[PDB]
Design a protein around this ligand. Structure first.
Ligand SMILES: Nc1nc2c(ncn2[C@@H]2O[C@H](COP(=O)(O)OP(=O)(O)O)[C@@H](O)[C@H]2O)c(=O)[nH]1
Ligand SMILES: [Mg+2]
Lengths: 122, 368, 386
RNA sequence: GUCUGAGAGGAUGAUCAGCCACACCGGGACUGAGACACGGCCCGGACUCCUACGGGAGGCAGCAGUGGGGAAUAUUGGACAAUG
RNA sequence: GGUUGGCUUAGAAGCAGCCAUCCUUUAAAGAAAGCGUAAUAGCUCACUAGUCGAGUCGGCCUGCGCGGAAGAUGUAACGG
């Protein structure tokens, strides 16, 4: 359950440390972004001499949330942080390393290199 | 004779065009006399090798008499010398061209043509919450200011410029005291009246217009403008909009006028693509020469600074590439194309290096 | 095995009817199919590589090998098919009408086959059912033999078989029908040698992308189009620059090594010693001495008419368009011969070309001529000069 | 010690020899006469790689050699015949 | 048919524009009323002959109509 003006940890090797949601994409009045949803972020803290500078505006994917994601059996799967992975101008990962686990809702075609590099895929 | 349409007219033989890179301020302009003398050396050695010593040493004295009295501190971007027997013209132009010596029948006026082609005539609407001014401008200079003695304002039915905002609320008469908060609507209707005057003057001379003022002022104007497709740019960071000189405002619009000139070259890329898709675009140098020479050239698109020497004979119309430009070839084979396209009632567009490809430096939209 | 063949000759001489004749006769033992004339005459149009061709792709097989048979419904279609090389024909069935044999269409077709590099022509004459005489048939045979000899083809030892495609379709066992198509099949199965395989040709691989791996060296990627490359193979870099020697130290695909790089697959290959800026796209990898670079060459060029996209204006001497050789474009200056100043669109002649820098080529290589990305013609190398 | 310098001095510490310290980075020890161990162990870390995704492997500042950096510095050699 | 009238124009060939409206085979055919072409080309028209057979063609004035005619609580512009 990510909404605008919400801070997310960065879970990839992109140089960003914390990003803030400035738009939930995919609908006129779309309120919330869960895992697998694409958001527009502004990077708030960055690592020195990194790929992403503080203050950039770019795309990210939500990879884990504190609210949690539901499964068909009815189980919920909650995390201790809200994390995101920064994306390209065509919404593709720019990551060579993924930090922490991600869920299995990233299975598809565009978030495959996020699942393969993830240490753990729940 | 110091104009494009006297140099295109005069047909001397030989007709020497010398272009010298000069500088506007000191100490950069210290190498201007040296560069002038250096160009005169190569042209003097070229004339003695091409025609004879007598012709070389009459042309050179004809230009030396002219250049003897030269300040070299009032130099513009380039010093163009157009010389012949019993005639020498000395024009300083603000364009950047590469130093060359052209000896031919013509007078190598491709940079004069390119400077005449980069000429914007526009209107400057100066908006404030207190007044409105209208300046008509040609490039970097103001043509007029539209005063009360302009005489293009004589038979007007709207308020003539300068237009005072003498609405009821500005003086306190009428009604609707401040608490109604109609200030925005009063400003919007005042700019509507200003646009009525602008349109009534535009319909008679139809130039593009630049809008100058505060952000909210020019936005209120764009809300209200009756012909908003004639606006080319808005400039919101201009200073001294009431007491300022007409030239001063024209100065502050120059960045916007050059951005519009760049947009007018990005829009020619689609014209080139339309020609290419209609199979009416020639890009080979020989092809463009033939098409321009037999009057088929509608528009010529030349990359900035593109110069090429070639062996041209119009009897057979064969443009073969040159080897050393020292064998009787035409020094500016592309300037000959430009001259022929202008001759046959065409246009020449000189496209900057980053919109036109380096490897395909010329492109002619043909008439068939 | 597989062999590509086709019928060339004057229009109305029965090329399509004869192609149907071989189809129906090969349908004996179910090798082919009884083929309708109209279905093959209605050749589909394919606008491949910005070039539009009507071609009827007839297929059949014999106890010897399978044949890919090519038919075109017009001279322009035949010329386009030969020069764009939709399917190189290593054997051509020259269709000669028993009357009015050596027409200008056949005249230019034989020359076109010579230029494009068709190694073998088998002569078959039809409409013999319309001809009752023998000495004019012999005269036609002598004429076609002399014409073949006139353009480096054997002629004297060229097999000539005589028949009638209409009788072949009818089913008459008269010598001018089924027996005629039966021998014609025999010469097709005997006289035409089995063509060389891509993997059997000398190794060649145009370079499309140049990589570098720490600890491994320079990697150049591209589709190997002939031969095999293996670790330890001596290979040379030919093309834009002057020829450089190197040695294969590894062939890999998807970051995994291969035992060898075969023709037809997009393998990458490692080079010994060469640096990442000593090699570039456009150059080829070849067996040392297999190919040589040239800037001046003579090519059979077909100028596309406006109907194929093509070009509005004609070619002329001194025109310098871009030439595309398998991975790269290079500016070449068209050089016509004496008496050819104007080259009309829709025609095809032989021109000389001088490229701005050398390209690894040999006789038979095919290239595209374009300007602005618009194909203005096609060509095929017929001679290389230094 | 080396260069320089008449010398005194000045500058320097390649190749050879003595001593010291280090062995991808941080830490701990084991075994052993001797190590807190260059091609040993354990834990942690960064990076690189393999994987069936559960897990694993590695450290040329040894000799060759590669990529890179650079103005610039070599062979992916032979033999234990000699001295060890 | 002279003939792509002359001029102008890159081109102006009946048909961008300016100055005349000429002659010939004629039953008739404009130095052309349109479309078309970059210019030509091409398709029409004016005009004449043929076929069929009886009324027809175009202006002017007058009366009554048609379109032009889109708004906010509900028909809502004959009181019904
Ligand atoms: N009598 C006779 N007629 C033939 C023969 N071959 C072809 N024709 C006729 O000639 C026509 C044209 O021949 P076709 O095959 O279409 O030539 P292509 O179109 O150039 O390939 C066909 O329609 C046949 O009717 C033949 O051997 N004998
Ligand atoms: Mg046919």
């Amino acid at each position: 359950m990510i909404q605008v003006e919400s801070m997310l940890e960065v879970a990839d090797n992109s140089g960003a440390r914390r990003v803030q949601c400035i738009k939930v994409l995919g609908g006129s009045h779309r309120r919330y972004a869960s895992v697998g949803d694409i958001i527009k972020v502004t990077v708030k803290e960055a690592i020195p001499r990194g790929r992403v500078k503080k203050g950039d505006v770019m795309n990210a994917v939500v990879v884990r949330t504190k609210k949690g994601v539901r499964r068909p059996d009815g189980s919920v799967l909650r995390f201790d942080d809200n994390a995101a992975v920064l994306l390209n101008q065509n919404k593709a990962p720019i990551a060579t390393r993924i930090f922490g686990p991600v869920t299995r809702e990233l299975r598809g075609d565009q978030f495959m290199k996020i699942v393969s590099l993830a240490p753990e895929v729940l | 004779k110091a104009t494009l349409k006297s140099l295109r007219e005069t047909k001397a033989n030989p007709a020497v065009s010398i272009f010298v890179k000069t500088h506007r301020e000191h100490p950069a302009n210290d190498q201007d006399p040296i560069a002038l003398k250096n160009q005169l050396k190569i042209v003097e050695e070229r004339l003695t090798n091409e025609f004879d010593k007598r012709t070389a040493t009459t042309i050179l004295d004809k230009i030396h008499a002219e250049t003897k009295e030269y300040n070299h501190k009032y130099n513009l971007d380039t010093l163009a010398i157009f010389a012949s027997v019993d005639d020498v013209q000395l024009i300083r132009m603000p364009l950047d061209t590469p130093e060359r010596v052209v000896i031919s029948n013509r007078f190598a006026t491709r940079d004069l043509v390119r400077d005449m082609a980069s000429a914007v005539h526009y209107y400057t609407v100066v908006l404030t919450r207190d007044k409105a001014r209208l300046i008509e401008a040609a490039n970097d200079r103001v043509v007029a200011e539209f005063d009360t003695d302009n005489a293009k304002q004589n038979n007007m039915e709207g308020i003539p410029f300068p237009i005072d905002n003498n609405g009821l609320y500005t003086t306190g008469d009428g009604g609707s005291d401040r608490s109604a908060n109609n200030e925005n609507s009063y400003l919007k209707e005042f700019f509507n009246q200003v646009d009525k005057s602008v349109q009534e003057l535009w319909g008679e001379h139809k130039m593009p217009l630049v809008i100058v003022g505060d952000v909210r002022n020019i936005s209120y104007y764009k809300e209200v403008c009756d012909r908003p497709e004639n606006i080319i740019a808005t400039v919101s960071n201009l200073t001294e909009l009431e007491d300022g000189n007409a030239q001063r405002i024209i100065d502050g619009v120059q960045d916007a006028v050059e951005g519009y000139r760049t947009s007018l070259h990005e829009a020619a890329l689609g014209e080139i693509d339309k020609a290419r898709g209609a199979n009416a675009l020639s890009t080979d140098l020989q092809d463009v020469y033939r098409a321009a020479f037999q009057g088929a050239g509608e528009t010529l698109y030349v990359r900035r600074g593109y110069i090429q020497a070639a062996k041209v004979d119009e009897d057979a119309q064969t443009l073969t590439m040159a080897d050393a430009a020292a064998d009787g070839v035409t020094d500016d084979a592309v300037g000959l194309i430009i001259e022929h396209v202008i001759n046959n009632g065409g246009k020449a567009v000189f496209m900057p290096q980053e919109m036109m490809s380096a490897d395909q430096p010329i492109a002619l939209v043909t008439r068939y | 095995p597989h062999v590509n063949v086709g019928t060339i000759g004057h229009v109305d001489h029965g090329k399509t009817t004869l192609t149907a004749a071989i189809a129906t006769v090969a349908a004996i033992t179910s090798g082919g199919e009884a083929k309708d004339y109209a279905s093959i005459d209605s050749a589909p149009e394919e606008k491949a590589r910005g070039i539009t061709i009507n071609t009827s792709h007839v297929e059949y097989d014999t106890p010897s090998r399978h044949y890919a048979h090519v038919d075109c419904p017009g001279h322009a279609d035949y010329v386009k098919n030969m020069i764009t090389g939709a399917a190189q024909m290593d054997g051509a069935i020259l269709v000669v009408s028993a009357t009015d044999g050596p027409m200008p269409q056949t005249r230019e077709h034989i020359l076109l086959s010579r230029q494009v590099g068709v190694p073998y022509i088998v002569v078959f004459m039809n409409k013999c059912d319309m001809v009752d005489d023998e000495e004019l048939l012999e005269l036609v045979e002598m004429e076609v033999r002399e014409l073949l000899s006139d353009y480096d083809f054997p002629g004297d030892d060229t097999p000539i078989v005589k028949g009638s495609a209409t009788e072949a379709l009818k089913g008459s066992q008269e010598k001018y029908g089924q027996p005629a198509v039966v021998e014609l099949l025999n010469i097709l199965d005997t006289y035409i040698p089995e063509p060389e395989r891509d993997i059997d040709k000398a190794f060649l691989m145009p370079i499309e992308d140049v990589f570098s791996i720490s600890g491994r060296g320079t990697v150049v990627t591209g589709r190997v189009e002939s031969g095999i490359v293996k670790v330890g193979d001596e290979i040379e870099i030919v093309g834009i620059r002057d020829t450089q020697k190197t040695t294969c130290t590894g062939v890999e695909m998807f970051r995994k090594l291969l035992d060898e790089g075969r023709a037809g697959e997009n393998c990458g290959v490692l080079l010994r010693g060469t640096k990442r800026e000593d090699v570039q796209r456009g150059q080829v990898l070849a067996k040392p001495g297999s190919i040589t670079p040239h800037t001046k060459f003579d090519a059979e060029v077909y100028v596309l008419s406006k109907e194929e996209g093509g070009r509005h204006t004609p070619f002329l001497n001194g025109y310098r368009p871009q030439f595309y050789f398998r991975t790269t474009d290079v500016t070449g200056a068209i050089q016509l011969q004496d008496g050819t100043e104007m080259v009309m669109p829709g025609d095809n002649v032989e021109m000389g070309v001088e490229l701005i820098h050398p390209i690894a080529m040999d006789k038979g290589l095919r290239f595209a001529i374009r300007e602005g990305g618009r194909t203005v013609g096609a060509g095929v190398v017929a001679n290389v000069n230094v």
